[PDB]
């Protein structure tokens, strides 16, 4: 007799913050601490009817009477200044450690076997495989989602803060490091070992991450956008913290855990964010189907209940979405 | 036809019942309803107070009421492409056509 508890919850490790945007000139990015913020303004927009209309009602009368109707929309837009060409994005990140221990549980035997399974994992192999992939997703600039496409140069600065002062600095070139491979450098492995020590409880780390992207004078940046509930009525609004455009923290947290490449469909497509029934929202489909046996909710209770440990590349997936958090069980 | 008369009685008894009408919140925008369904002059009647809403053309209120009535009676290509939406617009036009004559005999 052994079964899954009714309520089982996990808090998250790797808590990021929001990312405020700011604007300045390239080759002044060393003194980039008094640069002004990128603000959100509004503008008006009208356009024709261009959606794929239904063929049950497709006559020239409707197509010429739909043009004269006046469509006025108010949109939120965020640009760079006319004399600046570099976007700076800054946030902080702290990893916590204590990943296999739940925040709530019901059975007394289930948590004592889950802790033993996770401790057996950590004793067999450390957090050295997940941490280099997290440091890879920090090393390039995947947290810049659409601000990264088409940029001339990207540069990332990472500080380690252990008092009210810095302790270690890193500088990377985010376009030399791809978005496809996971290869090991000598400077990247120090950061990998640092955030591997942070995930094991053997220290307190707090990183400050800055990214510079060179796009061009007066060009359009893309902050995160909000939800509006409802003749010139606003149809798009953008997220903002005090007089500054921003990106949500959950979007950067999604861009950080694009880790797994062990899903059975392909590997030339590249990495996928770690989710149960691993699913891409822009693609519309769901890899790791429960008809196959490469789920979180199948590998987890085959590993814990029936003592059938999966392959080594598939244990990183279970530990990755235990690090992610959430409510499992019933 | 019943829905027009309920709004007429609500304008006649709601603003006309209470003996007070101060400055609206956002007077650059809250002045159409404060001018149409608003009372006569009061203690705060300035120089351009009793010579603005009674001397101006009180005929925009009919189109403003028709713009509110257009939301209630739903229109689309299912009705506008057929011949019943034209009569459904003409009935509202014949109803709101008296909205400037019966709703414009007070000031002018």
């Amino acid at each position: 007799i052994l079964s899954t508890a009714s309520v089982l919850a996990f808090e998250r490790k790797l808590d990021p913050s929001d990312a405020l945007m700011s604007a300045g000139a390239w080759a002044q990015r060393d003194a980039s601490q008094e640069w002004p913020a990128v603000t959100v303004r509004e503008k008006s927009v009208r356009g024709t009817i261009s959606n794929r209309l239904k063929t049950k009602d497709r006559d020239p009368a409707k197509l010429d009477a739909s043009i004269q109707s006046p469509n006025l929309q108010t949109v939120d837009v965020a640009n760079l200044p006319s004399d600046a060409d570099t976007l700076k994005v800054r946030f902080t990140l702290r990893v916590l450690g204590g990943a296999g221990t739940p925040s709530a549980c019901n059975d007394a035997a289930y948590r004592d076997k889950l802790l033993q399974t996770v401790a057996t994992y950590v004793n067999e192999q450390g957090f050295a495989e997940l941490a280099r992939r997290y440091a890879h997703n920090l090393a390039n600039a995947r947290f810049l989602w659409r601000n990264r496409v088409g940029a001339e140069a990207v540069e990332v600065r990472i500080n380690h803060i252990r008092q009210g002062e810095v302790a270690r600095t890193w500088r990377f070139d985010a376009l030399a490091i791809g978005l496809r491979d996971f290869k090991a450098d000598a400077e990247l492995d120090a950061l990998a070992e640092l955030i591997a020590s942070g995930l094991s409880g053997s220290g307190h780390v707090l990183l400050e991450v800055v990214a510079f992207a060179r796009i061009g004078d007066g060009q359009e940046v893309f902050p995160s956008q909000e939800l509006i509930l409802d003749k010139g009525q606003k149809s798009k609004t953008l997220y903002s913290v005090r007089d500054a455009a921003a990106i949500h923290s959950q979007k950067i947290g999604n861009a950080l855990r694009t880790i797994d490449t062990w899903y059975p469909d392909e590997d030339g497509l590249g990495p996928i964010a770690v989710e149960p029934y691993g699913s891409v929202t822009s693609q519309g489909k769901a890899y790791r189907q429960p008809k196959q046996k490469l789920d979180f909710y199948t590998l987890l209770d085959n590993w814990v209940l029936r003592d059938e440990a999966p392959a080594v590349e598939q244990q990183h997936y279970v530990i990755a979405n235990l690090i992610r958090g959430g409510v499992f069980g019933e | 036809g019943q829905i027009c008369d309920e709004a007429l009685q609500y304008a006649a008894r709601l603003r006309e019942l209470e003996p007070g009408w101060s400055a609206t919140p956002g007077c650059q925008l809250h002045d159409a309803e404060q001018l149409w369904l608003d009372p006569l002059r009061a203690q705060t009647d300035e120089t351009f107070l009793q010579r603005r809403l009674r001397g101006d053309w009180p005929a925009e209120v009919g189109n403003r009421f028709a713009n509110w009535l257009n939301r209630a009676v739903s229109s689309d290509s299912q009705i506008l492409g057929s011949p019943e939406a034209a009569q459904w617009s003409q009935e509202l036009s014949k109803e709101l056509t008296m909205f400037k004559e019966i709703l414009e005999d007070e000031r002018d």
């Binding site: 309520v7 919850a9 959430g326 409510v327 499992f328 069980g329 019933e330 | -």
Partner: protein, 124 residues
């Protein structure tokens, strides 16, 4: 396949006509009875005929399972459900066709979900 899965797979899909290739039409005709025939048909009537034949003690379970497997590969459009329950977090969401998404409706679990399904209807 169980019969509960048969009425489930019959009700959750749209009604489509001419959704089959002719190879699957003769494949289904090889697996149905002698007398009745389906041609230029929609989904529902096929579901009703195979349900009536399985209610009769005349058609076997592997054969109706092949029929419902073929209907499972063929139909690709589903009906959008009106309510959706998030189960660990105890929340009920309602579909809004103007946002093309589910918005937050109330707090509750399976009993409250069955209550609003019986009150408002399951599908859109």
């Amino acid at each position: 396949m169980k019969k509960i899965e048969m009425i489930e797979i019959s009700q959750n899909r749209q009604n489509l006509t001419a959704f089959l290739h002719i190879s699957e039409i003769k494949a289904i005709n090889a697996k149905l009875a002698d007398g009745v025939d389906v041609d230029k048909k929609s989904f529902d009537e096929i579901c009703s005929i195979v349900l009536e034949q399985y209610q009769a003690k005349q058609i076997s379970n592997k054969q109706a399972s092949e029929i419902f497997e073929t209907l499972a590969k063929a139909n690709k459009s589903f009906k959008i459900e009106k309510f959706r329950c998030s189960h660990g977090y105890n929340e009920i969401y309602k579909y809004s066709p103007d946002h093309e998404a589910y918005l937050f409706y109330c707090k509750g679990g399976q009993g409250q979900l069955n209550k609003l399904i019986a009150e408002n209807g399951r599908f859109m």
